[PDB]
Write a protein that binds this ligand. Structure first.
Ligand SMILES: O=C(O)CCCC[C@@H]1CCSS1
Length: 333
């Protein structure tokens, strides 16, 4: 059956390591949890967690362009780079973080669980603006990001309860707190959200036969999860400097553009009419698309409209419209 997991830890790197461990051990979680030893997992998961003062960048973002590191270090704010796409965001105990894991893509349904939460339990009429945002009065109150894997889909986003709104501009080189509209709390919102989650996945069953129960697991101390060598690997990587701050290597040429789906920046070198090495920074949610773009580097492409066009024809991506637009951009510079 579905799972509700909670982490009382408040370190961004620790909770991100938990999240990555759940994504990378989905079908086996029932063993890492002490529930079952044989049966393998395939049901929905909701994981709730909070983090102290932090800046989380994005798998493909440039730290130096989004963050004013001086004030971050001066104010003792932690820095991290997540595995999903999106822009740089700030975290503190005034905001909640949710992580939906599913067998198939479940974005819309997840957003429906959240909207049902706000409406039913707080009379907050909320709308979803784009693929990844929730507004209440055309003002952002939640922000999501996604990652896909063979058997797992991960939709993890942030909900704003009592976040310090003004402090943001100190670190990120409008927002609305859901307290401006209600007397909500992290515990209140969380409980309501678990309710609408279990209830959402209890439709098929008839109520008269099934218990009206809720179950909550706590994993921040589950030694099977947090004492694993894989977990420590993730934690150390996220704590590492080369990962968060990325790579400095310079590059000969650099192009850029602002697309509806986010900004794109290509750095590349060319030797003997061939695209030698390169790298892509972006603000995009479609990380798959961007890695497929990265496949252009360190391969033998003649740096010609012909060979480039061919190379784009060779790709089979999730979003073919975005790819068409991006190639139509590259062939002009
Ligand atoms: O607005 C965006 O670009 C999505 C923000 C997603 C932030 C991540 C939710 C929990 S960790 S960071």
């Amino acid at each position: 059956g579905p799972l509700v997991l909670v982490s009382n830890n408040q370190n961004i790197h620790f909770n991100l390591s938990l999240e990555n461990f759940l994504l990378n051990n989905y079908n086996d979680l029932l063993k890492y949890l002490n529930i079952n030893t044989i049966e393998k997992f395939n049901e929905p998961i909701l994981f709730l967690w909070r983090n102290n003062r932090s800046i989380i960048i994005g798998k493909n973002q440039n730290i130096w362009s989004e963050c004013n590191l001086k004030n971050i270090k001066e104010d003792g704010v932690l820095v991290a780079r997540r595995f999903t796409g999106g822009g740089a965001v700030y975290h503190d105990l005034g905001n909640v973080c949710f992580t939906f894991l599913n067998n198939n893509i479940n974005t819309s349904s997840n957003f429906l669980i959240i909207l049902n939460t706000l409406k039913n339990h707080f009379n907050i009429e909320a709308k979803t603006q784009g693929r990844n945002d929730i507004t209440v009065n055309d003002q952002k109150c939640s922000g999501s990001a996604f990652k896909k894997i063979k058997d797992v889909f991960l939709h993890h986003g942030t909900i704003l309860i009592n976040l310090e709104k003004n402090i943001l501009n100190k670190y990120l080189t409008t927002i609305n707190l859901s307290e401006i509209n209600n007397n909500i709390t992290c515990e209140n919102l969380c409980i309501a959200l678990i309710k609408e989650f279990t209830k959402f996945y209890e439709q098929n069953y008839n109520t008269n036969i099934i218990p009206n129960d809720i179950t909550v697991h706590y994993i921040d101390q589950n030694n099977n999860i947090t004492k694993n060598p894989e977990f420590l690997k993730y934690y150390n990587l996220l704590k590492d400097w080369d990962w968060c701050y990325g790579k400095t290597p310079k590059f000969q040429n650099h192009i850029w553009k602002q697309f509806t789906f986010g900004k794109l920046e290509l750095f590349f070198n060319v030797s003997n009419g061939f695209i030698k090495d390169g790298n892509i920074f972006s603000d995009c949610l479609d990380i798959n698309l961007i890695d497929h773009l990265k496949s252009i580097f360190n391969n033998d492409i003649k740096y010609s409209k012909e060979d480039i066009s061919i190379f784009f024809k060779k790709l089979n991506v999730e979003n073919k419209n975005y790819l068409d637009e991006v190639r139509s951009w590259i062939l002009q510079e």
